[PDB]
Design an enzyme around this catalytic site. Structure first.
Site, PDB file in Angstrom:
ATOM      1  N   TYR A  54       0.859  -1.195   0.000  1.00 30.93           N
ATOM      2  CA  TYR A  54       0.000   0.000   0.000  1.00 30.93           C
ATOM      3  C   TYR A  54       0.893   1.241   0.000  1.00 30.93           C
ATOM      4  CZ  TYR A  54      -3.204   3.502   2.099  1.00 30.93           C
ATOM      5  OH  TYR A  54      -3.960   4.609   2.359  1.00 30.93           O
ATOM      6  N   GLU A  56      -0.740   4.778  -1.028  1.00 33.33           N
ATOM      7  CA  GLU A  56      -1.589   5.937  -1.369  1.00 33.33           C
ATOM      8  C   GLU A  56      -0.919   7.287  -1.059  1.00 33.33           C
ATOM      9  OE1 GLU A  56      -6.280   4.990  -1.573  1.00 33.33           O
ATOM     10  OE2 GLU A  56      -5.573   5.265   0.476  1.00 33.33           O
ATOM     11  N   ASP A 200      -1.138  12.854 -26.707  1.00 31.03           N
ATOM     12  CA  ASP A 200      -1.299  11.446 -26.345  1.00 31.03           C
ATOM     13  C   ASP A 200      -0.487  10.641 -27.348  1.00 31.03           C
ATOM     14  OD1 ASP A 200      -2.130   8.927 -25.350  1.00 31.03           O
ATOM     15  OD2 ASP A 200      -4.127   9.075 -26.236  1.00 31.03           O
ATOM     16  N   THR A 226       1.393   5.213 -22.846  1.00 29.55           N
ATOM     17  CA  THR A 226       1.367   3.871 -22.316  1.00 29.55           C
ATOM     18  C   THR A 226       2.805   3.374 -22.238  1.00 29.55           C
ATOM     19  OG1 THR A 226       1.205   2.997 -24.555  1.00 29.55           O
ATOM     20  CG2 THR A 226      -0.860   3.391 -23.350  1.00 29.55           C
ATOM     21  N   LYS A 229       3.386  -0.524 -25.349  1.00 34.42           N
ATOM     22  CA  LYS A 229       3.203  -0.505 -26.781  1.00 34.42           C
ATOM     23  C   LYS A 229       4.601  -0.533 -27.394  1.00 34.42           C
ATOM     24  CE  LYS A 229      -1.342  -0.480 -26.865  1.00 34.42           C
ATOM     25  NZ  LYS A 229      -2.157  -1.539 -27.525  1.00 34.42           N
ATOM     26  N   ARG A 235       2.150  -3.088 -18.723  1.00 32.92           N
ATOM     27  CA  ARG A 235       0.925  -2.314 -18.917  1.00 32.92           C
ATOM     28  C   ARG A 235       0.772  -1.261 -17.833  1.00 32.92           C
ATOM     29  NH1 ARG A 235      -2.835  -3.667 -23.174  1.00 32.92           N
ATOM     30  NH2 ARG A 235      -1.826  -5.499 -24.112  1.00 32.92           N
TER      31      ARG A 235
END
Lengths: 445, 442
Positions: A54, A56, A200, A226, A229, A235
């Site tokens: 964790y 956050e 993008d 991304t 790719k 990913r």
């Protein structure tokens, strides 16, 4: 239950499935959607104990326990991203937490736009091959279009139409576009109408990093991407943003960070961040530039072989990892080719041709070189990949003559015995060819 | 370059850090945020060629090449999920693509509501530290309340304000709440005001599978969760929804909200890891583990009660306990900091009577250490170390004024740092001897 017993021993059903996917990637010709074969090193970090942390919030400002190593990974991942793209840390920042591509773009939108503010992006940016949207639901979208004559972006109509629409954010990006996007022209239009430019660069980031194509960073406010790719990692998503003066300072950092967390996401996927970070170190190397040049060389080789067999290509060819085939003159639609190629172990997807409406069954087909170039395919090999695609297409045209509906066509591939053997013949040779080449990742999975 | 060389060879810098995290996970007491330790079988799916597979859309309707195997992994994961929560396929569907829990919840809002529709969730549902949420930005939210005296959710007051506010959706869920949520009662409210009940069982979902606590599926019609808290899987999210029967119209809208509205390609590696873990969750073994999680929470509570710590709501029916440190004279800020320095992980928490006030609380959870074969006696042993940490906190809070000075003192002072290093070494000895799910070295 130790928790440390292997997958093959503890879950045969799933291990049997995992192996079929590894065999398929090895035996087939993988040309689909700018995908790649992730390295072993990156994958090792991706399926690791980092999955359990964790964390956050953001590095520096996490005061609960345990996030100290994970801080140093996140901060490392940032430097490596800024390195890969040759960015001045004083001028640029990067947020490595976004879960994938779409969450990256969505976090930019919610960071910089009020609900119902206006956005402009390219119509059918990914090809429109799966026939609302986040962009369209919580904000007010208006598409700009390709020019049907040339296949290139109609920057004029975009400039003319944006003066009237008055958007606060324009997206410069397309995953189904075989040419270079004029980012400076998009920067003109944005500055005039008083809008943010978002580049993008999802499917072309590895090419931008290797410097085999122009950098959107020389012109964009914000850049999203991304990492799986043409960058060859796990990913994940990234959001790059400018920072410093121009002395009126930029105010992207805090709004972009606040949108990713707490607005949209929870704790980051530290396993994904580390796997990305592995790949970005790899991308900085000379090896990756030589790979990226080969990607371009191979796509251009593919383009030429298609042209030499009398195929039309959307926009005449490519300056890119992609080549978009226009099959309408040849006589076959994209859905039909797309299917036939699957049955001979060649992955592609159909693509909507510029001019055609939504209800026309897409007459194009998107192909790309990143995956196979990573398996050390050269120009000769892609030239031979086109031999296999052309033969598959010629089976399609034979079956188009003997069938009417798309459903008739599809059953006929399986059930007609003279057709199913020709497919089995082409499948066996395609597979004989592809297996022989090396494959990044693990041996077995 | 093959792409087949080891992580340790090709990236020593990253390999170092990876093992520091693994080492820290073995030697530490890990009580933070309902986190767990993932099975090796699950992490092998996570570290796999499935990462390479594009599959935008849904099983059966993905006509581009390459998706045959991943169509099966997705559908298998759905069956394994419906199985793990004892749900009939004719009555329940499940979407296994959400990238994590917050996307899983966000998909549900956009699936069912228009923008500016009204929502009601619990104020500070995660706790304290780290128009705020995306639910506040696009929709019209009005929070409902814990009762500040008792510790429990004010169901009566929730029903009062819900009659006024006319919400379209109500969120049952708290990741900082040591109690059972009365899902029956929440459905009674949502039926009355004509609203959807969303059950976010994110942190507690493993307990629901193992049947060790009551199920929200009896009373709710949409259920979201994570898969890396009590379920022990990889980091991901799920959306369960009704189907069948005058029919339900949740399937199509939920599916559309995930793709193409909010997400791109699914993470098939993560879906496959989840599928490994939901198979693990269907076993009697997992039920032993889960009972032990509930009993280790009670064992942790009672040892803190036995040294006169007030706990929010008197104790726990749960995997976690909420410790009120206002009586004891320390705040969650200082507590979590000391504990960090002795390899104990937890986070600060807002106490029911107070917002901008330094949170005087603490959230501690069983799941992670219970997965290392921790019994009741081992958790009472954990409380000993936590208590020594609190004591050292009071020792320093007397000597120093402000948090910047406090934190500096814990490092710079000779006598404190040695008593820290001493406590630390006794925690790191104690914990290192226990078994650890996952790989040997990373």
């Amino acid at each position: 239950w130790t928790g440390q017993e292997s997958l093959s021993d503890s879950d045969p059903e799933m291990w049997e499935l995992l192996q079929r996917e590894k065999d398929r990637q090895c035996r087939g010709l993988e040309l689909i959607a700018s995908e790649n074969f992730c390295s072993r090193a990156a994958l090792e970090a991706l399926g690791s104990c980092l999955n359990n942390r964790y964390s956050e919030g953001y590095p520096g400002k996490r005061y609960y326990g345990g996030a100290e190593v994970v801080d140093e990974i996140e901060l490392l991942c940032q430097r490596r991203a800024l390195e890969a793209f040759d960015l001045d840390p004083a001028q640029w920042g990067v947020n490595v937490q976004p879960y994938s591509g779409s969450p990256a773009n969505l976090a930019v939108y919610t960071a910089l736009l009020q609900p119902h503010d206006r956005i402009m992006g390219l119509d059918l940016p990914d090809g429109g091959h799966l026939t609302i949207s986040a962009t369209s639901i919580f904000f007010e979208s208006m598409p700009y279009k390709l020019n049907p004559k040339t296949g290139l972006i109609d920057y004029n109509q975009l400039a003319l139409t944006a003066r009237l629409f008055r958007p606060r954010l324009i997206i410069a990006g397309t995953s189904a576009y075989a040419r270079l996007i004029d980012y400076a022209r998009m920067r003109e239009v944005c500055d005039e109408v008083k809008a943010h430019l978002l580049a993008d660069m999802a499917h072309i980031s590895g090419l931008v990093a290797a410097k085999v194509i122009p950098s959107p960073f020389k012109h964009a406010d914000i850049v999203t991407t991304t990492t799986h790719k043409t960058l060859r990692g796990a990913r994940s998503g990234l959001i790059f943003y400018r920072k410093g003066v121009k002395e009126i300072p930029y105010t992207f950092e805090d709004r972009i960070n606040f949108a990713v967390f707490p607005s949209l996401q929870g704790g980051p996927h530290n396993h994904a961040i580390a796997a990305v970070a592995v790949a970005l170190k790899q991308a900085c190397t000379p090896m990756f530039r030589e790979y990226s040049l080969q990607v371009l060389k191979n796509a251009r080789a593919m383009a030429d072989a298609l042209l030499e067999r009398g195929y039309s290509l959307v926009s005449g060819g490519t300056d890119n990892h992609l080549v978009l085939v226009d099959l309408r003159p040849k006589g076959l639609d994209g859905a039909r080719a797309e299917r036939v190629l699957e049955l001979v172990s060649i992955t592609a997807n159909k693509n909507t041709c510029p001019g055609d409406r939504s209800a026309i069954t897409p007459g194009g087909l998107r192909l790309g070189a990143p995956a196979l170039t990573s398996r050390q395919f050269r120009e000769d090999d892609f030239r031979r990949v086109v031999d296999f695609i052309d033969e598959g297409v010629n089976i399609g045209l034979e079956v188009k003559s003997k069938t009417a509906k798309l459903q008739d066509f599809k059953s006929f591939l399986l059930k007609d015995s003279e057709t199913s053997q020709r497919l089995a013949n082409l499948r066996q040779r395609v597979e004989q060819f592809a297996r022989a080449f090396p494959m990044p990742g693990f041996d077995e999975h």
